[PDB]
Amino acid sequence: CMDILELSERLDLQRFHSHTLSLYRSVCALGNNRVAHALCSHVDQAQLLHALEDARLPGPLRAGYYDLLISIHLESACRSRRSMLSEYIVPLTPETRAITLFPPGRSAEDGPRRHGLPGVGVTTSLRPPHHFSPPCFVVALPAAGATEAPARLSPAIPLEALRDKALRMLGEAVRDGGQHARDPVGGSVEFQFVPVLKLVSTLLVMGVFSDEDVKQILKMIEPEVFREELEEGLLQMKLPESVKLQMCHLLEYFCDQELQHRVESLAAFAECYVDKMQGNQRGRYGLLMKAFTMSAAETARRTREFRSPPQEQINMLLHFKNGADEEECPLPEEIRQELVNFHQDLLAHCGIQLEHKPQSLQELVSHTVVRWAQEDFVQSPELVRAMFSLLHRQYDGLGELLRALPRAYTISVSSVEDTMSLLECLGQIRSLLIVQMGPQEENLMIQSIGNIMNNKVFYQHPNLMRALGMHETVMEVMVNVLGGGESKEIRFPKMVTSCCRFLCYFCRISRQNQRSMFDHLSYLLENSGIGLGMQGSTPLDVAAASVIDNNELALALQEQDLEKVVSYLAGCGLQSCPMLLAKGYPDIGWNPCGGERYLDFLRFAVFVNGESVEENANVVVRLLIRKPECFGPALRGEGGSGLLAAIEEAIRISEDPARDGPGVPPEENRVHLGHAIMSFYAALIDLLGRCAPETHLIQAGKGEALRIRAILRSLVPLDDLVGIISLPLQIPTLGKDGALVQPKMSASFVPDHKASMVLFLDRVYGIENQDFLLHVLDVGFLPDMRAAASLDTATFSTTEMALALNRYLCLAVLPLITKC
Amino acid sequence: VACFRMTPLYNLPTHRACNMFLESYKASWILTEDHSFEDRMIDDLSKAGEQEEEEEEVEEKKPDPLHQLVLHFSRTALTEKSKLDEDYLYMAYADIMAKSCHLEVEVSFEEKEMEKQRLLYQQSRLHNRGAAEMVLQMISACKGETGAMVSSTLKLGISILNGGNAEVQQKMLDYLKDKKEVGFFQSIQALMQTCSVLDLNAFERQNKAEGLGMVNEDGTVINRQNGEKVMADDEFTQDLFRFLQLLCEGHNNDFQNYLRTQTGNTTTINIIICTVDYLLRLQESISDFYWYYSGKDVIEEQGKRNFSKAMSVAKQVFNSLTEYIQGPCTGNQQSLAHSRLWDAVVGFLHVFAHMMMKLAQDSSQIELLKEL
Amino acid sequence: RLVYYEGGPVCTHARSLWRLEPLRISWSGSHLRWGQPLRIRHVTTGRYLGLTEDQGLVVVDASKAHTKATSFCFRISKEKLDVAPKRDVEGMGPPEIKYGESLCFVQHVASGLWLTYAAPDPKALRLGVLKKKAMLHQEGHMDDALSLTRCQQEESQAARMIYSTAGLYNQFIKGLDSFSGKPRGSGPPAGSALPIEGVILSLQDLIGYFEPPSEELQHEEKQTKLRSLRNRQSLFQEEGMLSLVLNCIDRLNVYTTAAHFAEFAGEEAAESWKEIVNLLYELLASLIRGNRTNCALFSTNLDWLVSKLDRLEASSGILEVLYCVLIESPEVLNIIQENHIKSIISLLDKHGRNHKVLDVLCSLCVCNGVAVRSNQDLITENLLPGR
Amino acid sequence: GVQVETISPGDGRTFPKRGQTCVVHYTGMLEDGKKFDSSRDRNKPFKFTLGKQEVIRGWEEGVAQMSVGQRAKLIISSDYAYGATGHPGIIPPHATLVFDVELLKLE
């Protein structure tokens, strides 16, 4: 061994060891807490804390060890806190009520001229705490296998001691910089300042500094501006550009703290003001009720207010900025004056309200940035970008608050615990955006989604969730995984299935959520090119859920999206499924099982709330006829064998093994080709019948409606529908002294296939002649009703076939007979 | 039952009321507030300082802060990349720079000339620091992708070109001819092809959406939060064609010829013919929309608004063509003579005749008749 | 050997470039005129568009490219007015055809047929091909007119370089395969002579050609140079020079040392074996450096690269190639395996404390801000505990 | 496994009893003599309760034989240590562990 300080002259060893430290950082980069714990064995806390103060280390090694400390112990916590720092969930507590824009002083009675020190005071915005685990290498290994144990936490390092040491080193650096010695720590001013400033910035963003610590940091930055009622601060020391970048990071943190203070003060004021408004309106309503028919017209003229939605009541009550009379806005003058005074205070705090010494953070930042740019032609593009971002924030104070408010939300005290738990889960999910998906990441993602679903707040505060952008994060994770290995099989089908269960419930939670997800329909449609491997839920299911039962969305649906779905369906109707071919299924020349999903999406797009949407229906019909291969091989032009013949052939396939499956099973053989073909044709007929025009339009005699009905009639003959409805079903039968011979629902002709044909017949052709009605009853309906009745015995009552027959009857057949 | 049912604000939970108040207050008080800081910011960034104390004898005086900002954005635009990532900083500073050039009884002749001189000085503060080159570089970098980046770039270009600034025109032309890049005109052509026109299917879908009315409390629900789907990018189309007109304004023969044939470039794009093509598309859309409204006795309010939007865009396009040809630029005159312009004129004449004869018979649409 | 009408990204590749060669040497650069006979040469392959009686429209070798078969002309219309002949002019002549503007019909002079597209047959639409076979027909169609677009000097030079380099390296590969398995014993090399000097010079020239721009250039010039470099790298890869270089490396890798190579090629040839292999690896690094597509090409065969890391003739070159691939391609990182990581660590074990191996290991962990937990864990578990 | 060799004597009377909390300092080394862990480096005693299977069987069996205040060397075979699996990144598979353990107090 040698002294590590010999690496100042042994340059080859210095280079190798610095790159070794880089490798240490890389192997634990981006939240690998397990590898961080492992590295705590190779570079322990004593070594790290000694290197931090070692003033004789070469610059590369000093920087490497500072970065190693940050990477091992602070990086993941800092990153999670940074991710959470851009949202303001203010709990309505007494601490929140105590927050005010300006310190309770007397410098100026209104909008006290002097701000408070940035980052010093009370903040109530919810940020989840930090979690660390002691580094110990004698504990018993968790017997729990991999992908089951909880994710490791970052190794712990004494934070109060690290905080004190960081401040002391920063102070020493400032004094030495003032002295201007010829042997700077680390070999240069850059290697003396940049590491310490990185450590301090990381600790600030983590938010471990106390109020006294933050005050000391502020006095180090600028003794005069941040005095409280060496004289050379950091901002005036003729520093290199990298040190200037770190100073910009510090100033960014403090500006963000002032913005957070503004948002919290606004929320605290809003609580009291809205309470006063509510009391006012309650009193006014009491007086209105007391008024005994003073004038009925007058009573209506007041009461429309109370008939309007609360949002419009709020808007009406606040619409008095430029002046209004008691009729326009019933707020009393004192209530108005409170808001006017607060608005003046807010403008003053933002600096709107209109010295050679800055005397404020805004003036300090502006003057400093302009002075730097005036002094030198800055060469670092990162430094230039940071400088001008800071300058823009300082000049447009009100715009920053305006753009930050959309992410501000107020919650009641009773929701704080649940919101904190949900923030924990969301932090985990967000952290999964920077790591390549693996088994453990999949398990963590699934658990986070489950906790979020079981969390109460997820349902009660959908606006909060849209503001947090949970749907965007989950969608991004899903799309990353889908794109990864998209050509081959999609790994993590369980994770993608969860990617619906979450997003694809989230659409259902509220209509605004449905709008938010609808805004990404093309994205989901783009990524839904390949599926059906999941056997669960898919981005196509997300797309369908984003438009289901919403007329306003179905009308905003786009023709190019419909074209994408139609093209996918054409491809499915032209080429066999590669996954099935690999599994060994016989090649049939097309993909009924994917065509069925595409047809289901189109069905949800064209049929809403029991009524056809003509705009989408006409487009879909035109696209389907312009790509006839979508109709499937049966309805092909020349070689088409007809729908009835196709269904009969499908039945024969189903009864014939070695032509229905591999012939060599989580869902008991997954897909049976006979059932797949029947399901595809049933879905196609359902889609067409739903595209059929409405009866009122047909009676009105609209040319477009008549043309579409004629086209649908041409595609599907009546005889084919009647034949399919007349095809016989297998009925459960008793045999072998107790053996229930039940047909396999997933591999045979089921009543839903006939239900689709009944829908088409009712909506397109319609039953209008008694002879036809009697013929259909005699051949197709009555036998099925008789079978359903005969299955009423105790044994067969609850069989799958019996229940399917009951649903088929009561949803398709009996309503038709009732109508006719 | 909503008529009888009450939803007083005083029964709503406090936190929900706070969120509603924040949304309202933001929309009604903060958003309405008007702060004019752009001029102050640009003046502060343009002022250099202490150049005298350091007495730099290097004739290449270091760029002042505004110059450095423009250079940084030019760097970002020139960086080789697949696409132009959306940049809030660039948008904000482009908006600030654009607003810096204001372009604001009977004002006296001296007053008019003095406003003109202010505008020239304000535009000089920018184009003496590379703003024109930055605008061209960003338009080329957008690679024909519509978005806020290109919208801000076009607005900045218009801001520094307003009044037919000859110096800015010369700088832009010199930059284009020196760099000999096809990217600029390829991007312009792609944007012009992406520009939208009147869409009757979208109009009918919007009509049905409006006809639908939310049952539950509208404000509490989406409240039919539907934006204009018919010519939603009319502002962008007008900005694009205003930029092209401003390039040639003042009978600038050099741009009038360059917009037709880029001699130095390996491949040329005829922006005159691209403008004619867009005009033909717009004319066809307007004729379709008229035919839709032909039978109806009166035109409803949304129909009037859509006509007004389409007609403003058509007016801007006609102004751009006139600016292309006046001077006269014989090359552009021949190019338009051998184009599809005549068909567009024929369709416009048909629409004009029938729309005038119809709109005359009513008095609630005098404004539309005037605009026509 | 067949001609198609393709509309994908080939419109920017080198296999869509043709050179117009009038039937004359003097003033062959004169303004092209309507009806003037000329040959059309495929720049990259050096084959001439022509009409073989047995196969229709093809590209024939220069040796078989007689005027009757390979003479075409441009016409402004399909009307039969070629009766009037033309006389050679000793000068640039009158400008007749324009780039982009003029629309030209290609006609075979000897037969008079028109260059047109064949009728798309079924099952090709079904596969999804966007390429329509071109043919010579008596009538053709109405939209047979073609527009001529100039290609920049960069692509012209790159295409010609591709032609010459392909010829030279194919000759080299054939020479090696000549004595692949024929021990010379103590006498003649027993095979074709190797273009050693030409190969070395070509490799050096191409390395200089693909040399990255210096970091001291101003930003705009550096960006333009980078764009040019990416374009030229893509051109060479799309024409398959990457596969040719890999084939040459494969043939030269069979021999473990210069003496072993000499046992098959002779001492004179073996005197350049190490230099040639080093130059080939340097060229591969130059071709793939900074190019995500070229780097991602190695995902299918990464073992081919990792298995060569312990070769002692070109250790640094192979390591540089690996560094470029891993720095640019995340697809490779998603396929890295424990055996690959163990080989990279064995480089540290066997070659010494080289920080470039540490850089490679670092690049295996994170790429473009995304971390690969499997690689991180494997590196940790196989490198740290041993101490 | 675990074999215990005294380094400094303890009181010799008070021994850990199941359920008690032992406070210790330790310095871990591989059988080669490579340090991999030390509570003294973190400057904080390690606390663990017997019977809860918090520490490996080697500690469980060894610390039980030490009196309060005693310093001793514990040599633990792989089977009583992390064994075949090996604490990845720290302890190689099938590694014998040598610890220098001082039992400060019981609580």
Author numbering:
A (entry chain A): 1648 to 1876, 1923 to 2047, 2089 to 2398, 2411 to 2566
B (entry chain A): 3634 to 3737, 3752 to 4019
C (entry chain A): 244 to 630
D (entry chain E): 2 to 108
Quote from the publication.
RyR1 is the primary Ca2+ release channel of the sarcoplasmic reticulum (SR) in skeletal muscle, where SR Ca2+ release plays a crucial role in triggering muscle contractions. Using cryogenic electron microscopy (cryo-EM), previous structural studies revealed the homotetrameric architecture of the 2.3 MDa RyR1 channels exhibiting a mushroom-like shape that consists of a huge cytosolic shell (head) and a C-terminal pore region (stalk) spanning the SR membrane. While the cytosolic shell is mainly formed by a large α-solenoid network interspersed with globular domains, the transmembrane domain (TMD) possesses a 6-transmembrane-helix architecture (helices S1–S6) typical for cation channels, including a pseudo-voltage sensor domain (pVSD) (S1–S4) and the inner pore (S5–S6). To solve the structure of simvastatin binding sites on RyR1, we chromatographically purified endogenous RyR1 channels from mouse skeletal muscle tissues.
